[PDB]
Amino acid sequence: IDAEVIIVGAGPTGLMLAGELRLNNVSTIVLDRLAEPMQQSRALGFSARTIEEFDQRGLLARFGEVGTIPFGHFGGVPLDYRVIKGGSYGARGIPQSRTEGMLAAAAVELGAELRRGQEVVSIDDDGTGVAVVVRTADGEQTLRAKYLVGADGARSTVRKAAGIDFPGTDPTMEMWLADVAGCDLRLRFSGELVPGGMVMVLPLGPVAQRVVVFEHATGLRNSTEPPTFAEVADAFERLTGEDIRGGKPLWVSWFTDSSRQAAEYRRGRILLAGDAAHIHMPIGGQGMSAGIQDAVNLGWKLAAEIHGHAPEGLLDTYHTERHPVDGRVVMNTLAQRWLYLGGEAMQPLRELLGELVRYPDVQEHLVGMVTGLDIRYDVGAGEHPLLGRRIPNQELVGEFSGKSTTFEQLHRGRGVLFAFDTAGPQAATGWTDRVDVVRATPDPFHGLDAVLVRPDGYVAWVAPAGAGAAGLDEALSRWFGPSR
Amino acid sequence: NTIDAEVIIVGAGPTGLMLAGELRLNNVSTIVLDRLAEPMQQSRALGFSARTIEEFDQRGLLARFGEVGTIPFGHFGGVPLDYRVIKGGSYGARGIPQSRTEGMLAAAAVELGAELRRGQEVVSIDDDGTGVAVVVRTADGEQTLRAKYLVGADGARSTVRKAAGIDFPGTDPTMEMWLADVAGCDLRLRFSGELVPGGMVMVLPLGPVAQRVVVFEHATGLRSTEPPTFAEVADAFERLTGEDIRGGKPLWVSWFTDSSRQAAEYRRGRILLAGDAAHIHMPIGGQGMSAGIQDAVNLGWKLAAEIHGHAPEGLLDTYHTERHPVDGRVVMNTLAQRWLYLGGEAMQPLRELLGELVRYPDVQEHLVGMVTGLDIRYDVGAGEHPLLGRRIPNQELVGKSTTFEQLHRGRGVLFAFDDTAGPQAATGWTDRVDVVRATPDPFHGLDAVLVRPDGYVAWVAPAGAAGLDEALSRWFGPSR
Ligand SMILES: Cc1cc2nc3c(=O)[nH]c(=O)nc-3n(C[C@H](O)[C@H](O)[C@H](O)COP(=O)(O)OP(=O)(O)OC[C@H]3O[C@@H](n4cnc5c(N)ncnc54)[C@H](O)[C@@H]3O)c2cc1C
Ligand SMILES: Cc1cc2nc3c(=O)[nH]c(=O)nc-3n(C[C@H](O)[C@H](O)[C@H](O)COP(=O)(O)OP(=O)(O)OC[C@H]3O[C@@H](n4cnc5c(N)ncnc54)[C@H](O)[C@@H]3O)c2cc1C
């Protein structure tokens, strides 16, 4: 074999999973047909949960200073995204090229091999390994790994070759974007309803803006080619009366509300993640972000599989955990698409939702969906609010400096038993090779003595104040496998 | 110039007749005109809202009806709800056809001295700023009638609204439902409404041998201004269910659309609007007639106080400012429900989202509040106590009485829960506000509640007479 894992696609999903696999000491090869990274950026940010999953690995610092957007919308209804702890509408002004730039740098630094101008054309799972035919410039070759991951986009070669179904809804509309320098346009970050449709203006840097247009009168073009700048500028003008034709065009692109999901995330030793497993209309943080969550869910599970300590069922929890969460992103984006872009027909449902966001528990629910901070995985019985949820980022007073954080302690990408009493640290000794013990004092941890976290950050087990390792052995064995 | 009465109401529908009752309770001379020779035989509505029950019970109008049964559960655009989440709440009154409502309202109104004149069509209106002249077409030729105020309670196509020049903005119809009342078929009942391939079907009970068949198909769109024929409906019911009702007795055929419009102004000078003349929307449950009844109960005491020369400056102008937004929320919520319930597969993501949101108590209560009329809160000025601007709940008093039993005269009431501070302050207001010394957890921590003649709380005393003179003057006018 050329590597224990081959990843098809060096977008954010593939490069993030490359990072997680190298943290696990899984030898990995990343393939991409593109000779060069895409120069233009589709996403301009990523979600609050995606901020936390970068920060969890110390990747967020590699951007430098990253600022967040406090306010946003759901289906055109304004919302303060600070109403859940750590919540925002997403990272501000981090273009997708910068994001892929950072994740490749981290993956190559950690030993992932990146090979560009390599198109996968055929895959073969025999049930002891996976083989891939790759078209280079030099000719054709055959690479081999224990597991193949398709992170290869909306038209996933791997998904098709694997025979997995991509069911959902058909495009009912398009939006067009033009990137234009020198127009000095007034921003419209959430978009803005106007007679005839909707306009967004997003910043790109001091002298360029992205204009985004939707028109009720348009009109699926039923083309595979982008609209022209002239066409986008005509749309912008009918919508706002503003003329961008004097500007310098930098890019033109488009997207639709085609909303699909892979019926299976895993067939044998073939796995799917990111846009290969789900497409939907992009809204602000939503699109790339769940691909990063997919990769962070998969990596440690695929690695425990390959290292032979995978408990019975662990790699099957990739599908049962991520399929329903990615489906909810698909659903919420479709609901917002109709609320926001459905014209006067849908005004009553916008006014109704506008009324309902007066209730805290409604603002928290909508912010939770969009940020990715509401994710709760099935980790068996127990009713502690923290159980099955993201571990939040908290200052930890311990030995270490004499100060650290909970997120600093996940850089290694290992399981972690935070001990806030020796009982838990003592039962964990079976699992030192897979779980780190951190003794430090941190409120979501209020009446708690210990928290066990899977390597993705999600709480597998707590100890209320008094209990020792009451449930810990069962917990350790479910997610990390047999004691040594 | 001699006037025929202080108020002429155009329309003897439930809105007109409720208004006539309220005006007579305020001793306003009232003529009600209707072009129809008798009340409509066929019943459009088969009930009314939890708040409409209360406003009938508020006047002792629920006694020749007997016992009013309620529906404990309902839906919001398909999504099931328990409507008892609010105290006093329900999906509305069970099995009371509109004909029975109109008979009861006509009874109380003519009893109380309102003059109801049938075969009288209003064809012309002139408001010269001192009164309003109405040209009436009768079988005995034409007459001119004159009043101080004219109220259009004259339905969806208000003669009065157009003659007053008042815009009726809103949405055009996008669909039609068809109904047919059929005796003898003994159909399976479909109370809530039931989605089937190609549309939706209701079958409601009318009595032992009669059932109402309601029909909508995504394929019919819009067609004309005539009703559909019984055959067009029976055909539709077979396309939707396969069942054949063509061997039953046709009793009635009709239809309604999702046309959703609201009068831009509830008042222009000496012309006011109420009920369907002020708002139409697709009828869902007790929604349609119910808001007209709340309109009448908001307006009556206000238009009386204006005519009798004691209105606070601005009192009658609160008819528009209170009722326009509230009736707005009915038009909005019912359109919302029409797109959730009947919007098809493209609306499934929104059905799923609202499915998720209703698991929160406060969104259940919000939706149940909207639909029942129990959420209504009027601007009554400063104060954060939860009762202010809301309906007074029906409570037991102490030999013993009810808060509602005290509202039958349709006057303001000072509910004094031992003190004589409030009742002394109200001495100047005794001609319009009645003092009830009686003891009644919604009133907990209160020594007194002041209530407008419509049942809405204008002021409360925490444990004396602190601002009662301000509240009395605002709602009931200058002291004697
Ligand atoms: C116009 C537009 C605007 C968008 N806006 C947003 C936004 O605002 N926010 C947001 O979160 N998301 C947005 N998205 C979506 C977002 O870009 C995606 O969710 C994200 O790119 C997913 O990354 P991925 O790595 O999963 O897939 P991709 O980034 O598509 O990566 C797939 C990679 O696989 C490679 N590949 C494919 N097939 C093969 C093969 N056979 N052999 C080798 N290599 C192969 C391709 O070269 C490509 O590099 C937008 C998309 C569009 C089109
Ligand atoms: C098929 C159907 C089903 C419905 N189902 C329900 C339901 O289930 N629940 C619900 O709450 N509501 C329902 N509604 C609506 C409900 O019937 C109305 O909201 C209610 O009748 C309005 O009362 P109103 O007094 O405001 O108007 P109307 O009842 O329309 O009364 C208006 C009156 O004015 C008279 N008039 C009009 N113009 C003139 C004129 N120029 N001169 C003299 N008289 C005039 C007419 O004769 C008429 O009697 C339904 C309506 C329809 C059509």
Side-chain angles (χ1 to χ4, degrees), chain A residues 74 328 331 334-335 338-339 345-346 348-349 351-353 355-356 359 361-362 365-366 369, chain B residues 76 329 332 335-336 339-340 346-347 349-350 352-353 356-357 359-360 362-363 366-367 370:
Chain A
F74 188 98
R328 256 186 113 229
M331 173 267 293
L334 266 184
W338 287 108
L339 272 159
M346 293 289 122
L349 279 159
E351 185 187 337
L352 180 55
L353 186 63
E355 284 193 346
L356 295 182
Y359 300 110
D361 60 15
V362 179
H365 186 282
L366 293 181
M369 291 182 94
Chain B
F76 193 88
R329 298 221 304 134
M332 178 271 284
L335 267 173
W339 285 107
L340 285 162
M347 288 282 321
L350 274 171
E352 211 155 280
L353 185 58
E356 292 188 352
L357 295 168
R359 64 168 163 242
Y360 300 110
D362 55 11
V363 356
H366 180 98
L367 295 176
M370 288 205 288

Tab-separated table of all heavy atoms in Angstrom, chain A residues 74 328 331 334-335 338-339 345-346 348-349 351-353 355-356 359 361-362 365-366 369, chain B residues 76 329 332 335-336 339-340 346-347 349-350 352-353 356-357 359-360 362-363 366-367 370:
chain	number	residue	atom	x	y	z
A	74	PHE	N	-32.079	34.437	10.396
A	74	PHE	CA	-32.615	33.134	9.973
A	74	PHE	C	-33.794	33.417	9.044
A	74	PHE	O	-34.848	33.872	9.525
A	74	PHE	CB	-33.011	32.299	11.181
A	74	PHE	CG	-33.392	30.896	10.799
A	74	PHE	CD1	-32.483	29.856	10.912
A	74	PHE	CD2	-34.647	30.635	10.281
A	74	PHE	CE1	-32.838	28.562	10.555
A	74	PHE	CE2	-35.005	29.340	9.937
A	74	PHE	CZ	-34.096	28.304	10.059
A	328	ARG	N	-30.039	18.100	8.917
A	328	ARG	CA	-30.668	19.277	9.584
A	328	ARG	C	-30.132	20.589	9.015
A	328	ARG	O	-30.890	21.553	9.017
A	328	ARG	CB	-30.417	19.320	11.086
A	328	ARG	CG	-31.632	18.909	11.889
A	328	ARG	CD	-31.393	19.104	13.369
A	328	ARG	NE	-32.207	20.156	13.990
A	328	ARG	CZ	-31.741	21.117	14.779
A	328	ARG	NH1	-30.442	21.216	14.996
A	328	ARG	NH2	-32.577	21.969	15.351
A	331	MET	N	-32.009	20.887	5.792
A	331	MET	CA	-33.419	21.286	6.066
A	331	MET	C	-33.494	22.778	6.421
A	331	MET	O	-34.354	23.502	5.812
A	331	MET	CB	-34.019	20.468	7.218
A	331	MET	CG	-35.402	20.951	7.663
A	331	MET	SD	-35.393	22.162	9.041
A	331	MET	CE	-34.779	21.134	10.374
A	334	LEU	N	-32.999	25.048	3.539
A	334	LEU	CA	-34.172	25.028	2.627
A	334	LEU	C	-35.270	25.907	3.213
A	334	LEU	O	-35.858	26.697	2.439
A	334	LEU	CB	-34.654	23.597	2.393
A	334	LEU	CG	-34.082	22.941	1.144
A	334	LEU	CD1	-34.699	21.566	0.931
A	334	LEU	CD2	-34.280	23.840	-0.064
A	335	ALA	N	-35.539	25.775	4.514
A	335	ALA	CA	-36.555	26.587	5.213
A	335	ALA	C	-36.196	28.069	5.054
A	335	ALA	O	-37.064	28.867	4.646
A	335	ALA	CB	-36.643	26.196	6.662
A	338	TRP	N	-36.831	29.462	1.485
A	338	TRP	CA	-38.256	29.764	1.194
A	338	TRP	C	-38.694	30.985	2.006
A	338	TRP	O	-39.304	31.906	1.413
A	338	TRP	CB	-39.155	28.535	1.411
A	338	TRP	CG	-38.946	27.528	0.327
A	338	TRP	CD1	-38.311	26.324	0.420
A	338	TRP	CD2	-39.276	27.697	-1.060
A	338	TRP	NE1	-38.252	25.717	-0.806
A	338	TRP	CE2	-38.856	26.526	-1.728
A	338	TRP	CE3	-39.946	28.686	-1.785
A	338	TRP	CZ2	-39.057	26.342	-3.091
A	338	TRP	CZ3	-40.144	28.500	-3.132
A	338	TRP	CH2	-39.709	27.340	-3.772
A	339	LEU	N	-38.359	31.028	3.297
A	339	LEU	CA	-38.725	32.180	4.155
A	339	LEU	C	-38.234	33.450	3.486
A	339	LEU	O	-39.012	34.376	3.342
A	339	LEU	CB	-38.104	32.029	5.540
A	339	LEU	CG	-38.963	31.243	6.502
A	339	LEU	CD1	-38.109	30.700	7.622
A	339	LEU	CD2	-40.114	32.107	7.011
A	345	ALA	N	-45.696	35.806	-1.043
A	345	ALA	CA	-46.377	34.556	-0.651
A	345	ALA	C	-45.928	34.131	0.757
A	345	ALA	O	-46.741	33.554	1.515
A	345	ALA	CB	-46.053	33.484	-1.679
A	346	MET	N	-44.640	34.327	1.050
A	346	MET	CA	-43.960	33.822	2.264
A	346	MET	C	-43.815	34.946	3.300
A	346	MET	O	-43.382	34.639	4.396
A	346	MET	CB	-42.590	33.237	1.902
A	346	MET	CG	-42.683	31.995	1.075
A	346	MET	SD	-43.279	30.652	2.083
A	346	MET	CE	-44.739	30.171	1.164
A	348	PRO	N	-46.074	36.280	5.209
A	348	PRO	CA	-46.776	35.913	6.433
A	348	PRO	C	-45.913	34.981	7.286
A	348	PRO	O	-45.856	35.195	8.464
A	348	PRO	CB	-48.054	35.244	5.914
A	348	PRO	CG	-48.253	35.865	4.554
A	348	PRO	CD	-46.847	35.936	3.997
A	349	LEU	N	-45.231	34.008	6.691
A	349	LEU	CA	-44.389	33.061	7.475
A	349	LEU	C	-43.159	33.790	8.052
A	349	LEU	O	-42.804	33.449	9.218
A	349	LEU	CB	-44.039	31.834	6.630
A	349	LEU	CG	-45.155	30.788	6.578
A	349	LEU	CD1	-45.014	29.872	5.385
A	349	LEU	CD2	-45.224	29.973	7.868
A	351	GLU	N	-43.219	37.061	8.956
A	351	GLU	CA	-43.785	37.897	10.041
A	351	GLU	C	-44.086	37.000	11.244
A	351	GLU	O	-43.851	37.446	12.405
A	351	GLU	CB	-45.037	38.615	9.561
A	351	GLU	CG	-45.547	39.554	10.619
A	351	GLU	CD	-46.878	40.192	10.305
A	351	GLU	OE1	-47.253	40.270	9.083
A	351	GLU	OE2	-47.534	40.589	11.284
A	352	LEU	N	-44.561	35.777	10.990
A	352	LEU	CA	-44.807	34.787	12.068
A	352	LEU	C	-43.483	34.442	12.752
A	352	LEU	O	-43.422	34.480	13.972
A	352	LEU	CB	-45.468	33.531	11.509
A	352	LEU	CG	-45.753	32.448	12.546
A	352	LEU	CD1	-46.593	33.005	13.682
A	352	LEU	CD2	-46.450	31.258	11.920
A	353	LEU	N	-42.451	34.128	11.987
A	353	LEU	CA	-41.162	33.751	12.599
A	353	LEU	C	-40.621	34.979	13.324
A	353	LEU	O	-40.107	34.822	14.437
A	353	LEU	CB	-40.178	33.240	11.547
A	353	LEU	CG	-38.889	32.697	12.161
A	353	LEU	CD1	-39.166	31.483	13.041
A	353	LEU	CD2	-37.869	32.368	11.093
A	355	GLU	N	-42.174	37.171	14.964
A	355	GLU	CA	-42.875	37.262	16.257
A	355	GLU	C	-42.245	36.246	17.223
A	355	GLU	O	-41.919	36.644	18.380
A	355	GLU	CB	-44.365	36.963	16.097
A	355	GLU	CG	-45.182	38.081	15.479
A	355	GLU	CD	-46.679	37.866	15.636
A	355	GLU	OE1	-47.089	36.740	15.974
A	355	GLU	OE2	-47.435	38.823	15.432
A	356	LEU	N	-42.064	35.012	16.754
A	356	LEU	CA	-41.593	33.875	17.580
A	356	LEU	C	-40.166	34.110	18.079
A	356	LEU	O	-39.831	33.512	19.071
A	356	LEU	CB	-41.664	32.567	16.776
A	356	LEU	CG	-43.065	32.107	16.376
A	356	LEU	CD1	-42.993	30.784	15.630
A	356	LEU	CD2	-43.973	31.986	17.586
A	359	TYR	N	-39.056	35.059	21.778
A	359	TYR	CA	-38.868	34.061	22.872
A	359	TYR	C	-37.414	33.606	22.888
A	359	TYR	O	-36.930	33.138	21.878
A	359	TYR	CB	-39.818	32.866	22.716
A	359	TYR	CG	-41.254	33.307	22.752
A	359	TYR	CD1	-42.043	33.266	21.614
A	359	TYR	CD2	-41.782	33.891	23.898
A	359	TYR	CE1	-43.346	33.729	21.634
A	359	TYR	CE2	-43.088	34.355	23.932
A	359	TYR	CZ	-43.874	34.271	22.793
A	359	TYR	OH	-45.146	34.769	22.779
A	361	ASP	N	-35.887	30.872	23.983
A	361	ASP	CA	-35.693	29.448	23.615
A	361	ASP	C	-35.798	29.304	22.086
A	361	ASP	O	-35.121	28.419	21.535
A	361	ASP	CB	-36.602	28.540	24.453
A	361	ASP	CG	-38.101	28.781	24.329
A	361	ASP	OD1	-38.545	29.481	23.382
A	361	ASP	OD2	-38.826	28.234	25.174
A	362	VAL	N	-36.547	30.177	21.403
A	362	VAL	CA	-36.576	30.204	19.908
A	362	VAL	C	-35.264	30.795	19.379
A	362	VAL	O	-34.722	30.241	18.418
A	362	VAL	CB	-37.787	30.975	19.352
A	362	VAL	CG1	-37.775	30.999	17.826
A	362	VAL	CG2	-39.091	30.390	19.859
A	365	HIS	N	-32.614	28.217	19.712
A	365	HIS	CA	-32.817	27.031	18.842
A	365	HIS	C	-32.278	27.335	17.441
A	365	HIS	O	-31.587	26.476	16.879
A	365	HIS	CB	-34.301	26.628	18.830
A	365	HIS	CG	-34.595	25.353	18.103
A	365	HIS	ND1	-34.658	25.300	16.726
A	365	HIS	CD2	-34.879	24.110	18.543
A	365	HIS	CE1	-34.951	24.080	16.343
A	365	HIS	NE2	-35.094	23.327	17.447
A	366	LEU	N	-32.597	28.512	16.899
A	366	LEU	CA	-32.245	28.912	15.521
A	366	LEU	C	-30.731	29.165	15.468
A	366	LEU	O	-30.072	28.709	14.507
A	366	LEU	CB	-33.067	30.139	15.097
A	366	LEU	CG	-34.578	29.910	14.938
A	366	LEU	CD1	-35.298	31.171	14.497
A	366	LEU	CD2	-34.867	28.790	13.955
A	369	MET	N	-28.904	25.773	15.653
A	369	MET	CA	-28.936	25.025	14.367
A	369	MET	C	-27.797	25.523	13.486
A	369	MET	O	-27.113	24.681	12.887
A	369	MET	CB	-30.203	25.241	13.537
A	369	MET	CG	-31.433	24.652	14.112
A	369	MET	SD	-32.754	24.984	12.944
A	369	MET	CE	-32.687	23.448	12.027
B	76	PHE	N	-52.042	24.179	14.103
B	76	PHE	CA	-51.551	25.419	13.453
B	76	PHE	C	-50.870	25.000	12.153
B	76	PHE	O	-49.778	24.407	12.189
B	76	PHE	CB	-50.614	26.258	14.339
B	76	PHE	CG	-50.381	27.641	13.780
B	76	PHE	CD1	-51.236	28.696	14.096
B	76	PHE	CD2	-49.367	27.877	12.866
B	76	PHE	CE1	-51.053	29.962	13.546
B	76	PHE	CE2	-49.200	29.135	12.297
B	76	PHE	CZ	-50.046	30.172	12.627
B	329	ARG	N	-53.210	40.292	12.616
B	329	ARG	CA	-52.493	39.059	13.036
B	329	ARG	C	-53.339	37.837	12.625
B	329	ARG	O	-52.752	36.779	12.334
B	329	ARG	CB	-52.123	39.113	14.523
B	329	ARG	CG	-51.178	40.257	14.905
B	329	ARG	CD	-50.114	39.824	15.904
B	329	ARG	NE	-50.799	39.273	17.051
B	329	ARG	CZ	-50.534	38.145	17.710
B	329	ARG	NH1	-49.488	37.391	17.433
B	329	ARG	NH2	-51.313	37.824	18.726
B	332	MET	N	-52.711	37.501	8.692
B	332	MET	CA	-51.328	36.962	8.651
B	332	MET	C	-51.307	35.494	9.112
B	332	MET	O	-50.772	34.631	8.361
B	332	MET	CB	-50.400	37.806	9.541
B	332	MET	CG	-48.977	37.300	9.601
B	332	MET	SD	-48.730	36.107	10.927
B	332	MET	CE	-48.690	37.235	12.320
B	335	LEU	N	-53.166	33.042	6.508
B	335	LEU	CA	-52.323	32.877	5.294
B	335	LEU	C	-51.154	31.922	5.606
B	335	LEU	O	-50.882	30.987	4.762
B	335	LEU	CB	-51.749	34.221	4.842
B	335	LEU	CG	-52.534	35.020	3.808
B	335	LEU	CD1	-51.892	36.388	3.622
B	335	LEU	CD2	-52.632	34.298	2.477
B	336	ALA	N	-50.461	32.161	6.735
B	336	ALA	CA	-49.309	31.338	7.185
B	336	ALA	C	-49.744	29.876	7.240
B	336	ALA	O	-49.019	29.017	6.697
B	336	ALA	CB	-48.790	31.782	8.526
B	339	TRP	N	-50.321	28.170	3.809
B	339	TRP	CA	-49.075	27.783	3.108
B	339	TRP	C	-48.398	26.621	3.828
B	339	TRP	O	-47.846	25.786	3.136
B	339	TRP	CB	-48.161	28.987	2.898
B	339	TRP	CG	-48.672	29.865	1.807
B	339	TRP	CD1	-49.263	31.082	1.948
B	339	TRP	CD2	-48.717	29.555	0.406
B	339	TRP	NE1	-49.622	31.579	0.726
B	339	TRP	CE2	-49.308	30.660	-0.241
B	339	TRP	CE3	-48.282	28.475	-0.371
B	339	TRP	CZ2	-49.468	30.718	-1.624
B	339	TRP	CZ3	-48.454	28.525	-1.741
B	339	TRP	CH2	-49.036	29.633	-2.357
B	340	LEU	N	-48.501	26.512	5.154
B	340	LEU	CA	-47.910	25.347	5.866
B	340	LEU	C	-48.725	24.102	5.552
B	340	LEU	O	-48.116	23.100	5.177
B	340	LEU	CB	-47.866	25.579	7.374
B	340	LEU	CG	-46.770	26.532	7.807
B	340	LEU	CD1	-47.063	27.056	9.211
B	340	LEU	CD2	-45.391	25.887	7.697
B	346	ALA	N	-42.359	21.360	-1.200
B	346	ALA	CA	-41.428	22.504	-1.052
B	346	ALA	C	-41.522	23.143	0.352
B	346	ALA	O	-40.519	23.752	0.764
B	346	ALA	CB	-41.684	23.524	-2.130
B	347	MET	N	-42.657	23.012	1.060
B	347	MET	CA	-42.889	23.607	2.410
B	347	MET	C	-42.541	22.622	3.529
B	347	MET	O	-42.663	23.007	4.715
B	347	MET	CB	-44.354	24.020	2.571
B	347	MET	CG	-44.714	25.251	1.735
B	347	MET	SD	-44.170	26.842	2.430
B	347	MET	CE	-44.500	26.557	4.167
B	349	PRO	N	-39.603	21.425	4.575
B	349	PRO	CA	-38.571	21.967	5.474
B	349	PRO	C	-39.143	22.941	6.519
B	349	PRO	O	-38.780	22.835	7.671
B	349	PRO	CB	-37.580	22.666	4.528
B	349	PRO	CG	-37.805	21.963	3.184
B	349	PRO	CD	-39.288	21.655	3.153
B	350	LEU	N	-40.070	23.820	6.139
B	350	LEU	CA	-40.698	24.749	7.116
B	350	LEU	C	-41.617	23.986	8.074
B	350	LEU	O	-41.685	24.395	9.255
B	350	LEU	CB	-41.470	25.856	6.398
B	350	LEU	CG	-40.628	27.060	6.002
B	350	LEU	CD1	-41.443	27.992	5.119
B	350	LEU	CD2	-40.091	27.802	7.226
B	352	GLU	N	-41.124	21.014	9.132
B	352	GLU	CA	-40.175	20.328	10.041
B	352	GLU	C	-39.660	21.333	11.077
B	352	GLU	O	-39.686	21.007	12.283
B	352	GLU	CB	-39.057	19.705	9.219
B	352	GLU	CG	-38.483	18.448	9.821
B	352	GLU	CD	-37.876	17.608	8.715
B	352	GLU	OE1	-38.664	16.912	8.013
B	352	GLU	OE2	-36.642	17.714	8.502
B	353	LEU	N	-39.249	22.524	10.643
B	353	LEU	CA	-38.777	23.606	11.569
B	353	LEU	C	-39.864	23.960	12.598
B	353	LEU	O	-39.564	24.018	13.793
B	353	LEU	CB	-38.408	24.847	10.758
B	353	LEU	CG	-37.805	25.996	11.564
B	353	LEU	CD1	-36.555	25.535	12.300
B	353	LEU	CD2	-37.479	27.155	10.653
B	356	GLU	N	-40.214	21.423	15.067
B	356	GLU	CA	-39.181	21.538	16.122
B	356	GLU	C	-39.562	22.671	17.063
B	356	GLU	O	-39.468	22.467	18.268
B	356	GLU	CB	-37.785	21.748	15.549
B	356	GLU	CG	-37.265	20.543	14.809
B	356	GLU	CD	-35.814	20.684	14.399
B	356	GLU	OE1	-35.251	21.789	14.563
B	356	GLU	OE2	-35.248	19.677	13.936
B	357	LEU	N	-39.998	23.817	16.554
B	357	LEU	CA	-40.256	24.955	17.466
B	357	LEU	C	-41.429	24.677	18.415
B	357	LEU	O	-41.446	25.320	19.494
B	357	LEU	CB	-40.456	26.239	16.652
B	357	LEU	CG	-39.221	26.693	15.877
B	357	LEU	CD1	-39.580	27.782	14.895
B	357	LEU	CD2	-38.103	27.145	16.823
B	359	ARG	N	-42.180	22.280	20.269
B	359	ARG	CA	-41.819	21.516	21.485
B	359	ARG	C	-41.488	22.509	22.596
B	359	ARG	O	-41.287	22.035	23.711
B	359	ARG	CB	-40.686	20.530	21.195
B	359	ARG	CG	-39.379	21.197	20.803
B	359	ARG	CD	-38.244	20.206	20.826
B	359	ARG	NE	-37.070	20.669	20.102
B	359	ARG	CZ	-36.545	20.062	19.032
B	359	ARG	NH1	-37.105	18.974	18.517
B	359	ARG	NH2	-35.442	20.552	18.478
B	360	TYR	N	-41.438	23.822	22.321
B	360	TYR	CA	-41.240	24.870	23.364
B	360	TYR	C	-42.600	25.355	23.858
B	360	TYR	O	-43.444	25.765	23.061
B	360	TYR	CB	-40.364	26.030	22.871
B	360	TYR	CG	-38.976	25.611	22.448
B	360	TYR	CD1	-38.610	25.633	21.103
B	360	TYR	CD2	-38.040	25.152	23.369
B	360	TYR	CE1	-37.357	25.220	20.680
B	360	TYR	CE2	-36.781	24.736	22.960
B	360	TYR	CZ	-36.441	24.762	21.611
B	360	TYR	OH	-35.222	24.336	21.175
B	362	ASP	N	-43.537	28.150	25.094
B	362	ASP	CA	-43.873	29.570	24.823
B	362	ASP	C	-44.304	29.704	23.349
B	362	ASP	O	-45.128	30.581	23.079
B	362	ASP	CB	-42.820	30.551	25.363
B	362	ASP	CG	-41.385	30.353	24.911
B	362	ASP	OD1	-41.142	29.537	23.966
B	362	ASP	OD2	-40.525	31.017	25.522
B	363	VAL	N	-43.884	28.816	22.441
B	363	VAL	CA	-44.359	28.911	21.031
B	363	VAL	C	-45.744	28.263	20.934
B	363	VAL	O	-46.603	28.890	20.298
B	363	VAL	CB	-43.345	28.504	19.938
B	363	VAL	CG1	-41.981	28.150	20.449
B	363	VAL	CG2	-43.837	27.471	18.953
B	366	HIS	N	-47.967	30.978	22.282
B	366	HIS	CA	-47.996	32.093	21.308
B	366	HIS	C	-49.002	31.756	20.198
B	366	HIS	O	-49.881	32.586	19.931
B	366	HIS	CB	-46.586	32.400	20.784
B	366	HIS	CG	-46.599	33.512	19.799
B	366	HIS	ND1	-46.295	34.804	20.154
B	366	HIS	CD2	-46.921	33.524	18.486
B	366	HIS	CE1	-46.430	35.590	19.101
B	366	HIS	NE2	-46.837	34.818	18.063
B	367	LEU	N	-48.901	30.588	19.581
B	367	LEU	CA	-49.793	30.175	18.455
B	367	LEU	C	-51.240	30.041	18.982
B	367	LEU	O	-52.184	30.607	18.380
B	367	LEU	CB	-49.272	28.867	17.841
B	367	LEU	CG	-47.900	28.949	17.164
B	367	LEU	CD1	-47.422	27.581	16.684
B	367	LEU	CD2	-47.913	29.921	15.995
B	370	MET	N	-52.725	33.505	19.597
B	370	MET	CA	-53.078	34.126	18.289
B	370	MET	C	-54.485	33.678	17.909
B	370	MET	O	-55.316	34.495	17.538
B	370	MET	CB	-52.177	33.631	17.151
B	370	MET	CG	-50.779	34.154	17.185
B	370	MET	SD	-50.046	34.154	15.527
B	370	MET	CE	-49.797	32.413	15.283
